[PDB]
Amino acid sequence: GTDVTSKVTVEIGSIEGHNNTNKVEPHAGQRAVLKYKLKFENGLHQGDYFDFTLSNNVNTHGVSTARKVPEIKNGSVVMATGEVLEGGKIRYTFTNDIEDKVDVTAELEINLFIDPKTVQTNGNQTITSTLNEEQTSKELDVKYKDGIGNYYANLNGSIETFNKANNRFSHVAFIKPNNGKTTSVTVTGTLMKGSNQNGNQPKVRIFEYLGNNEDIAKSVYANTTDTSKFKEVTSNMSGNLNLQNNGSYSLNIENLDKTYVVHYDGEYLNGTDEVDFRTQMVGHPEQLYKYYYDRGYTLTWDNGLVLYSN
């Protein structure tokens, strides 16, 4: 069928931030929300379609690999289905149920997640959706978390991708020294929820960051295929890496004197209510043990998804 974008009118359009404030915290699992009330011209047919375009600071998926959006209904009847085509382009295609309908209107609510690749820093973003030349627009202040640190090191992470069809997810962790200090460390990954005790061993890849620390994305984002920014050292570190069938890994680094990224791709147990992935770093700043012993510091950062509640 044909492009009937010019036949769709936005009657009411708005974009809102978390709880209808002007702020969004993506690392607390918050998001923006686009709401539309659309009027349609008469005489549309099945297979006819309309497109709108989102600013590339947001998308409709967050960590999900899936690319569906909500259906446009008239009560119970599916009027249109929607798909993400590309940048960042949402197309709704009309069903058979638009045929011979008159004065059709419809509401549409779509969650809009802040993209960590295009929104790398804290601060205001202007979020827009454009439908048939009508621009709907909202400024939101995006605020990210800084990980967890001490005088010696910082640990931060985020789930990168989530793939329901394969029971897989990927995760990015950044580990760095602070204050010019070098400590010897053990870094672990553990599925605190959602471990498949009898699964495959995870793929874990480690990269040396080559840039200035000031340019590390606040969003927690590593484009590890930029070879001026990242150097893969997985080979070099392979004798210090252990992988387990319950999804855990462990990694020893004798001198933490550089910023590293650890990329994890693993599976989770089918049916789990939740997936909760812990990255933990244990450091030993001193090993003289004169007058005292203790085990050093521990930094712990968890990233979790809810798959069922409840």
Author numbering: 194 to 503
Text lifted from the article:
However, only rFnBPA(189–505) produced diffracting crystals. The N-terminal N2 domain (residues 195–335) consists of nine β-strands arranged in a sandwich of four- and five-strand β-sheets. The N3 domain (residues 344–503) has a similar structure comprising two β-sheets, each formed by five β-strands. The N2 domain adopts the DE variant of a C-type IgG fold (DEv-IgG) identified in other proteins including ClfA. The asymmetric unit comprises a single copy of rFnBPA(189–505); no density was observed for the N- and C-terminal residues (residues 189–194 and 504–505, respectively). In the apo-form, the G′ strand aligns anti-parallel to the neighboring F′ strand.
The adjacent fibrinogen (Fg)- and fibronectin (Fn)-binding sites on Fn-binding protein A (FnBPA), a cell surface protein from Staphylococcus aureus, are implicated in the initiation and persistence of infection. The N-terminal region of FnBPA contains three subdomains N1–N3; N2N3 binds fibrinogen (Fg) and elastin. The Fg binding mechanism is similar to that of homologous bacterial proteins but without the requirement for “latch” strand residues.
